[PDB]
User: Fold Fast Fluorescent Timer Fast-FT from Discosoma sp..
Amino acid sequence: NMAIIKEFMRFKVHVEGSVNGHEFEIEGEGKGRPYEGTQTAKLKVTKGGPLPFAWDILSPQFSRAYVKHPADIPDYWKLSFPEGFKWERVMNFEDGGVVTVTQDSSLQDGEFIYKVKLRGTNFPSDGPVMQKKTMGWEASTERMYPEDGALKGEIKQRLKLKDGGHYDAEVKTTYKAKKPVQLPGAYNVNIKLDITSHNEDYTIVEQYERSEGRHSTG
Assistant:
């Protein structure tokens, strides 16, 4: 797979979603160094803009081919190619907001292709998501473990707030290769996602993300 997952790779992403009933679409493209764990993306809202909610609930839904791993931890996402992988995620925010996501990752014409579907519900109208009071994610650690023939990850994820403090989410994701792939044992993925630029109404947004697997035993 080192022959097809090159040291520099591009991707395209399409998102269809709704948050508290507000429909939208995003198209974007990105690039990065899969073995170094780094990538950038530029996203454009193509339907439903400007979004009446915080961009930050969308940013983690877009790119698992770009996680650096030690040589002795199998990289489940890279090994799944050429066929690729899918994932499903649930985010429970502390004020009762919920985001559920499904995703398909494939490799076509030498680029990764990501398709995301998202449903956000039950965000309070006066809360930090619908009032756009958030200011980016703190760095996170996703605790990975194999279960039921799939790879699971759990995160206690924290969103900075305008007026101070944090807004918390509990996140669980199941990642599933489209063909049999060697599952890793338990380990951690450290993630930091930054919004590097955006226009005033967040209809054009650029991101940078660093993701690195680390042993949690040994």
Observations:
- The chain has one domain: 1-218.
- The two ends are 27 Å apart (CA to CA).
